[PDB]
Amino acid sequence: GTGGRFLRLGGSGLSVGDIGGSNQITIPTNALPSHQHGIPANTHTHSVNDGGHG
Amino acid sequence: SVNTANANLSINTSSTGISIQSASTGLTVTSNAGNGQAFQHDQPYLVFRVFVKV
């Protein structure tokens, strides 16, 4: 059955009638290009606790 | 003569007026996370044999 596939000559280790491939492709983890994210501007304060000192 | 004597006094505790203003952690970018790796992809296919007419 054709299966709506593409025509591929199979000289390299592919007997006649061989199938395979996939229309759906999944990006593997190691395929992700290196990139850097920017951290936005930040600002904070800490409250201070003190009962007193003699 | 008047003998030496102590003025019996003590210090009442008070909480210091102290506050902490704003600050930024200073970081602006993350660390690179990713490697550029070759990733295998194959479209659906069927394999035949080609013959050229002599």
Author numbering:
A (entry chain M): 218 to 271
B (entry chain O): 326 to 379
Question: Anything the authors wrote about it?
Answer:
A-1(L) is a Myoviridae cyanophage isolated in 1970s9 that specifically infects the model cyanobacterium Anabaena sp. PCC 7120. Using cryo-electron microscopy (cryo-EM), we solved the structure of A-1(L) tail machine, which consists of three parts: a 205-Å-long neck, a 1045-Å-long contractile tail with a complicated baseplate, and six pairs of tail fibers. The dodecameric gp2 portal, the pentadecameric gp5 and the hexameric gp7 sequentially constitute the neck of A-1(L), to which five neck fibers are attached.
A-1(L) possesses two types of tail fibers: six LTFs/gp34 trimers (274 Å long) and six STFs/gp33 trimers (258 Å long), all of which anchor to the baseplate in an upward conformation. The shoulder domain (residues Met1-Ile155) of LTF is anchored to the wedge of baseplate, via interacting with the insertion domain (residues Glu81-Gly180) of gp31B and the C-terminal loop (residues Val129-Glu151) of gp32. Moreover, the long helical bundle formed by the stem domains (residues Asn216-Asn282) of STF trimer runs along the groove formed by the trimeric shoulder domain (residues Met1-Ile155) of the LTF. The overall folded conformation of these two types of tail fibers suggested a state of A-1(L) in prior of attachment to the surface of host cell. Further competition binding assays showed that the arm domain of LTF and the stem-CBD domain of STF could simultaneously bind to the surface of host cells. Altogether, it suggested that the STF/gp33 and LTF/gp34 are indeed RBPs, which recognize and bind to different receptors on the host cell surface.
